[PDB]
From a paper:
CelTOS is a malaria vaccine antigen that is conserved in Plasmodium and other apicomplexan parasites and plays a role in cell-traversal. CelTOS is a unique multistage Plasmodium antigen that plays a critical cell-traversal role during infection of the human liver and during parasite transmission to the mosquito vector. CelTOS is secreted by Plasmodium parasites and is localized to the surface of sporozoites. CelTOS is proposed to disrupt the plasma membrane of invaded cells, specifically those of the mosquito midgut epithelium and mammalian liver sinusoidal layer, and enables the exit of parasites during cell traversal.
We determined the binding epitope of 7g7 on PvCelTOS by solving the crystal structure of the antibody-antigen complex. A 3.2 Å resolution structure of the 7g7 Fab fragment in complex with PvCelTOS revealed a 2:2 complex of Fab and PvCelTOS with two monomers of PvCelTOS arranged in parallel to form a dimer. Each monomer of PvCelTOS interacted with one molecule of the 7g7 Fab. The epitope for 7g7 in PvCelTOS has a buried surface area of 694 Å between the antibody and the antigen. The interactions between 7g7 and PvCelTOS arose predominantly from the antibody heavy chain, with all three heavy chain CDRs contacting PvCelTOS. The conformational epitope in PvCelTOS consists of a helix-loop-helix structure comprised of helix 2 (H2), helix 3 (H3), and loop 5. All the hydrogen bonds and salt bridges between 7g7 and PvCelTOS arise from Loop 5. All four mutants carrying mutations within Loop 5 failed to interact with 7g7. These results established loop 5 of PvCelTOS as the key binding epitope of 7g7. The binding of 7g7 to loop 5, which is located on the side of the PvCelTOS dimer, allows two 7g7 antibodies to simultaneously interact with the PvCelTOS dimer.
Residue numbers in the entry:
A (entry chain I), E (entry chain H): 19 to 239
B (entry chain B), D (entry chain A): 54 to 175
C (entry chain M), F (entry chain L): 22 to 230
Write the structure that this text describes.
């Protein structure tokens, strides 16, 4: 099918450059144009520029005339976006999209997975994981909420499954909050009192940046 | 039909019409004209079906623009050469390239087919 | 160049209610385009060329325009309709977007499922001590949480986090982690998590020893 | 198809090809392309008959020129205005109008649709 | 049918101007262009200019840039050609033709009758007609050639019929030759000896310039 | 600017002969057009777009050309084919024509029917005296005429006029009018008209007194 693949997240030291890529498939890479967009806060959407694969000519937004640099490689059916002098103001999620002009003002029919770029001098630190067990055991209502606490890691992207993903229903993983170059996540799960003490529950964690993947048996006390 | 062609174009000065609107509405006249021209010519077509006639106004319009797209860069080169010294005074070409290329940028924008402004050179 | 202002910034809607969001511009536009984005996902082509619907778009969607006032409307709100919607234009370079209009779903008011958890022995091994409070499956979103110690208070460590509309129940959730030093932790005995839910005249609260 | 468009135009610089030849052979590509575009889209057309498909490449080609003819004078006015002072310095327009109109006369010749050079004025 | 009518011949004094016309019919007068051409000696053909009826723009040959001036009138479906400072070199036949450009170099599909313009300070003088009958009568062949002599007229256009045109077979009308501002034409007819003495033969002449039309019985002597 | 030279200037052809006339140019031309003109008539569109034949033109005509040497050819000459043919081009302004190539018809050589006539009483009434000699229906065109008076000569008054290919017999004709003063006329007695031809071992001559 028609799909635009990109690169994964990039932790880049401040003031450095970065060269993300966006590959295409299904359609003819060269007949359509490739546009690039930025999203700060996960709220505001901003266009940077675009490039005609066949001609290779670029067109930039004034704000990013020299911040951004676009290149392509037809052999790999791939387009790239190059950035320089990265500041905190330059850290966001970056998308790539397809288009074709047929007289009416252009729109965007396909979007890439989005590449989240993070600028920070902070080091890559693996997370610290701590379980959460119902403390007093003081209310055996038929549904016992359990937890899992992830603390102290950088960059932000970390994933949390329960029993290796089997437990998909009734879970809640909260957005992390940064404090002193360290992200702090939590997750919870709600299950019946008649299952957990018998059914060995566990919590699955990952931090690909530091290449850290660990589980945690949850036990009562 | 020579009227519909003159009428659409005249709307750039009057109404300060968008460059996009004028180009968009003219392709209709031609496509509408070719479609209207042929209904007068062939009888096997005139009874071919409505779904066979409306799709034509599109196929033309699509080809027209896609042709126009592929045709922009070679036009600048031709324009560039036709005006590049010694075809024109170098002291005069100092005033030509930039303004030619600015308006040619204005086009590069609308069709979203950018062409670097290098072709215009010395 | 062209500033696109969408209002309301946020919007609730009950299933079946007529939803209409605006995109106020500074100048006129011939065509417009509307994009749907859900949490954590890329935007998706929803309404191109002002009123044309995309492949995989229900018919309840009908976006319109009026020169400078282009607006998106829905006949019947639905569960899957909940998302953030942006307006887009490319009549003039540069291309601009609206601030964004979030679209939530209206649920019957619900009470939070408050849970509280103490630190872990493994954490105390490292010199740190945190206490967590979970306020699950409530509605609406606006609620306040306060933390107390032996009838005292402490805002030096209160770290709260919110979620968005659950895909399944249109409910919400919150976490407050209270981080403390290993020493200041055991210095006190009673630890409590207060929840100021506004359809809960009695604050929902949990504690331990 | 984007190739056939670039190939024809490139022959103005290389081969010093006549302006008439280049324009004439391009309309063929489009007409050849539209006819080739539709054979891929509709099946009722692809089975309409050979005498019905060649006639298309003609009916199009005629309309194209007739449109171009009716479209020339409004274009000079538009071209004039987009570059006529105060859009540009009058001391600069002293060097622009004449050569713009020179080339626009060159067209007036080939299509044999003369336009007085008055549009270019002061 | 599609036909282009023009004006008749003009005797014009040297150094004067003239405004000839060319009307159209059958087709749409305004869709096709009108070109103007000259033919001196009845040998050499030269293009002068042409004009777009709808736009009204003209295009001249450098040789005739200011000699000729073209105008039109859609009301009458007519085109005009205006000339100034007429010289002997400016006396010739002028044609009008139709055209429409379809990419290939233009050609001429319809032609006018041709307008013969004569520049001369010489006066309009009616002709003098003299018959020609066999004197010694010694041409006792089965065919006695008779003649008719036209002398002394200006301008040149004069017509000669025999028996008011009935006698069409076996006639010969020779081109005139100018001498001292006076044209001299002759015609002959060949008929059997058994007819003329019995069949009263006569010779018909016209000179529209002077509005002069006379006949001459031919008699033996 | 472009000089078109057609050769031969004049050309004869017998019915059925392959006719070929040229138009040599100074530069190249893509397309060309050929026009036919007969005596006393306007030009007629004959071959447009180089090789396309016009409405109402026999198929024996097929004109071609390449670059600077474009030529018109006929498989089989016929009576109506006799005419003047011109080449025309409009690749470059100005538009130019060839010198012209006349096309005559070939007849068996024929002898002229010589007639001579004295002045008219009506002319002698006016003080003038002319003598005419008619040389009708001959072939080829080349002939000489001399006039004599009592074995003398006089070129002071010889005025000759020629015709073209007769439509019916493809023959020719000529007139010699000899003008003289009323007095000098009767000054002599014998008046004679001489004609020299090719099938004419004996010069044909007619006179009176
Ligand atoms: Na450019
Ligand atoms: Na002009």
């Amino acid at each position: 099918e028609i799909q635009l693949q990109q690169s994964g997240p990039e932790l880049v030291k401040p003031g450095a450059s970065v060269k993300v890529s966006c590959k295409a498939s299904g359609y003819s890479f060269t007949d359509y144009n490739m546009y690039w967009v930025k999203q700060s806060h996960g709220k505001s959407l901003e266009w940077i520029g675009y490039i005609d694969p066949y001609n290779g000519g670029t067109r930039y937004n004034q704000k990013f005339r020299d911040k951004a640099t676009l290149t392509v490689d037809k052999s790999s059916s791939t387009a790239f976006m190059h950035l320089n002098s990265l500041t905190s103001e330059d850290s966001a999620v970056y998308y790539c999209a397809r288009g074709y002009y047929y007289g009416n003002p252009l729109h965007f029919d396909v979007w890439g997975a989005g590449t989240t770029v993070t600028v920070s001098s902070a080091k890559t630190t693996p997370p610290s994981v701590y379980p959460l067990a119902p403390g007093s055991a003081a209310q055996t209502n038929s549904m016992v909420t359990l937890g899992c606490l992830v603390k102290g890691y950088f960059p932000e992207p970390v994933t949390v499954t329960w029993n290796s993903g089997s437990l998909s229903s009734g879970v809640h993983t909260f957005p992390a909050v940064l404090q002193s170059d360290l992200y702090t996540l939590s997750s919870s799960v709600t299950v019946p009192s008649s299952t957990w003490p018998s059914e060995t529950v566990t919590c699955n964690v990952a931090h690909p940046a530091s290449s850290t993947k660990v589980d945690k048996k949850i036990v009562p006390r | 039909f020579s009227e519909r062609i003159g009428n659409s174009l005249s709307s750039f000065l009057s109404e300060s019409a968008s460059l996009e609107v004028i180009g968009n509405e003219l392709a209709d006249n031609i496509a509408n004209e070719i479609v209207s021209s042929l209904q007068k010519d062939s009888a096997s077509f005139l009874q071919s079906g409505f779904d066979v006639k409306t799709q034509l106004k599109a196929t033309a319009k699509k080809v027209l623009v896609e042709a126009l797209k592929a045709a922009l860069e070679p036009t600048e080169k031709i324009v560039a050469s036709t005006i590049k010294p010694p075809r024109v005074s170098e002291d005069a070409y100092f005033l030509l390239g930039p303004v030619v290329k600015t308006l040619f940028n204005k086009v590069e924008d609308v069709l979203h087919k950018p062409i670097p402004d290098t072709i215009w050179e010395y | 160049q062209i500033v696109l202002t969408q209002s309301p910034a946020i919007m609730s809607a009950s299933p079946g209610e007529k939803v209409t969001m605006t995109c106020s511009a500074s100048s006129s536009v011939s065509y417009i385009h509307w994009y749907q984005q859900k949490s954590g996902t890329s935007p998706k082509r929803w309404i191109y060329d002002t009123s044309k619907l995309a492949s995989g778009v229900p018919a309840r969607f009908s976006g319109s325009g009026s020169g400078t006032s282009y607006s998106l409307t829905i006949s019947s709100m639905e569960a899957e309709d909940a998302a953030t919607y942006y307006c887009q234009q490319w009549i003039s370079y540069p291309a601009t977007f609206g601030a964004g209009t979030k679209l939530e779903l209206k649920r019957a008011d619900a009470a939070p499922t408050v849970s509280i958890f103490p630190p872990s022995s493994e954490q105390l091994t490292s010199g740190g001590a945190s206490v967590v409070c979970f306020l699950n499956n409530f509605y609406p979103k606006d609620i306040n949480v306060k933390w107390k110690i032996d009838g005292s208070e402490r805002q030096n460590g209160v770290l709260n986090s919110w979620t968005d509309q659950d895909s399944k129940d249109s409910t919400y959730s919150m976490s407050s982690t209270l981080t403390l030093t290993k020493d200041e932790y055991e210095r006190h005995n009673s630890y409590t998590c207060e929840a100021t839910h506004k359809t809960s005249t009695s604050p929902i609260v949990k504690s331990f020893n």
